[PDB]
Amino acid sequence: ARAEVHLRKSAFDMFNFLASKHRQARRATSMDLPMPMRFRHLKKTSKEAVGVYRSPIHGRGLFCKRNIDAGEMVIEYAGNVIRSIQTDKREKYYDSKGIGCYMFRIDDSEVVDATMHGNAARFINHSCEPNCYSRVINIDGQKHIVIFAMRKIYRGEELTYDYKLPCNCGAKKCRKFLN
């Protein structure tokens, strides 16, 4: 009230989602339809099946409002497909800038960064007993990081997979090592 100059001002976050509320077989990815049909379904339906909400696990997350089936596709981790030595340059850069580093790879040649270019798959937390995993698929010569499910993922459950460092997983199978 105009006299007590208070702290807790800067956030160091490029995104600003923290609102007052932050309200957290038919489909081809569960069918035996071919991989181009599943991949064409994935980009059209990851925009409308899941959503980004504020995460009590860590930061902001991916809180689905739908009974996600077992083994099906959920989201595609698409961002800056940079070379493997541009990884260290952007790691030093966003160490100097404070933005969190998001570098999950396909192989040991080029690593998908998710800092400038990215999607809603930046907001995937880590549970050591997760509900998803990933498999390297092949579409049109390109490779795509596709998050395949594990079980029936209910309404409200945040989406996590195995990344392969103490985590906020909350699970009892916790490794605390992600190197």
Partner 1 sequence: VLLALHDRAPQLKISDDRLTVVGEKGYSMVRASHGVRKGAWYFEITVDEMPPDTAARLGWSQPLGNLQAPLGYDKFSYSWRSKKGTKFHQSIGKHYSSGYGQGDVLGFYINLPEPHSEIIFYKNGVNQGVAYKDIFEGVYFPAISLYKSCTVSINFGPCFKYPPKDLTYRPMSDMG
Partner 2 sequence: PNYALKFTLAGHTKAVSSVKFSPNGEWLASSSADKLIKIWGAYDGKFEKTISGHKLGISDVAWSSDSNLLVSASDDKTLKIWDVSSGKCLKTLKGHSNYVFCCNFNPQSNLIVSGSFDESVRIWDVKTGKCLKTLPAHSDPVSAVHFNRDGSLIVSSSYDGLCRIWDTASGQCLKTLIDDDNPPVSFVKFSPNGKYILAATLDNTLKLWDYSKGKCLKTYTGHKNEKYCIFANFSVTGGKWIVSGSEDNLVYIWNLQTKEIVQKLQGHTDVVISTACHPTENIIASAALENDKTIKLWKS
Q: Does 124 bind Zn ion (CB under 5 A)?
A: no
Of 11, 48, 172, 177, the residue at the interface with partner 2 (CB under 8 A) is: 11
- Quick one: 166 exposed, middle or buried, by C-beta within 10 A (0-12, 13-18, 19+)? exposed
Distance CA 60, CA 116 (A): 17
Of 169, 173, 178, 179, the residue at the interface with Zn ion (CB under 5 A) is: 169
Of 87, 126, 144, 157, the residue at the interface with ligand SAH (CB under 6 A) is: 126
Tokens 């807790």: give the residue.
8
Q: Does 167 bind Zn ion (CB under 5 A)?
A: yes
* Binding site partner of 129, from partner 2, partner 1, Zn ion, none, Cβ cut-off 5-8 A by kind: none
Site string for partner 1, 65-84 (x = CB under 8 A): ------------------xx
Q: Does 107 bind partner 1 (CB under 8 A)?
A: no
64 is in an annotated binding site: no
169 is in an annotated binding site: yes
Phi, psi values for residue 78, rounded to 5°:
-120, 130
Extract the runs of DSSP E, i.e. beta strands, from the chain.
52-54, 60-62, 73-76, 80-83, 103-105, 110-113, 132-139, 142-149
Site string for partner 1, 136-165 (x = CB under 8 A): ------------------------------
- Judged by beta carbon, residue 78 or residue 167, the one nearer Zn ion is 167
119 is in an annotated binding site: no
DSSP SS3 for 148: strand
Of 69, 91, 110, 162, the residue at the interface with partner 1 (CB under 8 A) is: 110
Q: Is 12 left (phi over 0), alpha (psi -120 to 50) or beta?
A: left
- Interacting residues with ligand SAH between 77 and 96 (CB under 6 A): none
Q: Which residues contact 1 (CB under 8 A, 6 or more apart)?
A: none
Tell me which amino acid residue 124 is. I
Of 109, 164, 166, 173, the residue at the interface with partner 1 (CB under 8 A) is: 109
